[PDB]
């Protein structure tokens, strides 16, 4: 089940960590980017939609499927205050 998440980055940034990526599989066979910690009262947390275990599919139509950890991190660090996430739930 794919969902849309729209965020406003805060003073602690977006408020979550990721893993995975081509060459850094978080789950064997799966090169995807996964959300691994949602941080207390950060942006992601206040909004409430994003969940530990969520696959990230996109950020601002920069595509996060089959990319490297650092390609994903780059794209997520290269964001304004306005952040759109497309995710797939388990």
């Amino acid at each position: 089940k794919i969902m849309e998440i729209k965020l406003i980055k805060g003073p602690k940034g977006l408020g979550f960590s990721i893993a995975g990526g081509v060459g850094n599989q978080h789950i064997p066979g799966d090169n995807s980017i996964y959300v691994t910690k949602i941080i207390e009262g950060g942006a992601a947390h206040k909004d409430g939609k994003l969940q530990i275990g969520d696959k990230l599919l996109a950020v601002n139509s920069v595509c996060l499927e089959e990319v490297t950890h650092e390609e994903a991190v780059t794209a997520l660090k290269n964001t304004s205050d306005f952040v759109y996430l497309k995710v797939a739930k388990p």
Partner: peptide, 4 residues
Amino acid sequence: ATGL
């Protein structure tokens, strides 16, 4: 993992 990478904090964002």
